[PDB]
């Protein structure tokens, strides 16, 4: 609670929507990504970069809605633990698509293509979660 004060009040004004507009941005950036044919490695890096950044952001926002509210009271409402779990899955997929490849053999995971499509769908379900 010593810091829970200064954080939980920073997570309002105007992080309320910026965060949301940033989700719209994300989906838009993806649609552009998937629509541009034959983009180079360098263009691809560039758009992968913007996707990761925007994902890193959403990740921090969530180590604050937890540091600030506290492990147990966010975590009580499992409804928010969905939207939180969602963030984490997509961050993991994106980190690997955009940067951590080609270490993925090491994960021993298969189904990589559907993992991806999943994580793209999840970004949309994030707004759907929003009433």
């Amino acid at each position, epitope marked *: 609670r010593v810091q829970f004060r200064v954080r939980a009040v920073i997570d309002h004004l105007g992080m309320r929507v910026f965060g949301v507009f940033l989700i719209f941005l994300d989906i838009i950036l993806m649609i552009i990504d998937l629509s541009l044919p034959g983009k180079s490695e360098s263009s691809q890096s560039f758009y992968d970069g913007m996707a990761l950044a925007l994902s890193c952001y959403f990740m921090l926002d969530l180590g604050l809605r937890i540091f600030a509210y506290g492990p147990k009271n966010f975590f009580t409402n499992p409804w928010e633990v969905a939207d939180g779990l969602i963030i984490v899955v997509t961050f993991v997929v994106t980190i690997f698509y955009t940067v951590l490849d080609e270490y993925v053999q090491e994960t021993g995971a*298969d189904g990589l*293509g559907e993992l991806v499509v999943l994580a793209r769908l999840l970004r949309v379900v994030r707004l759907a979660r929003i009433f």
Partner: antibody
Amino acid sequence: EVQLVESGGGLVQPGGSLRLSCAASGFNVSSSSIHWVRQAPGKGLEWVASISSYYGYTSYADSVKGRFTISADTSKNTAYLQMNSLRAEDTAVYYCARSYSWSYAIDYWGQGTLVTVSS
Amino acid sequence: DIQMTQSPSSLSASVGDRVTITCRASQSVSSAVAWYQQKPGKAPKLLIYSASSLYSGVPSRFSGSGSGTDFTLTISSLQPEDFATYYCQQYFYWPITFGQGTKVEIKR
């Protein structure tokens, strides 16, 4: 246990048609991916077509686009490949094979069926 | 489309030897690579998926590695029953492609 039983092969004149069949047991066509891959006698493996019913998703090799059609009767747990306008280059052993879904490795093949295209 | 350039197209090694087979992909396919073994007049069987995961029940002498776009099947104590042809495939982009194969002969 997983089994895939192909039938429908054999001898056929150029211009003609055949309908291969693959009978599935041990898993469900309706949620899996079925592939047909072929092998011209003495040569490598050429992928031909795939279906993942769950997504209304099929796909084809260019050598075959337009002439062959893949499909599944999800209630007979069977897949089919309809082959029209056969040419001699289509002579091959035609293998049915499966994977968990479309982005997962193929993990099982049938013993295949011999298609011979000749006058 | 994507090519899997695989070599050597054939090799001959003794029982107990460690053989290496290589497959280069024309562009990154991540870890969607699989290796198959095919004995003469039989359906291929799967050995490795995601580049390096041993498929269940396959003898562990068979292993796979990824380096960028270079894939390696290693058979590390060659047994006489390992005479076969080994095909790499990528299944990341479409169409699915196979390398031309390595035809392994056992030196006795």
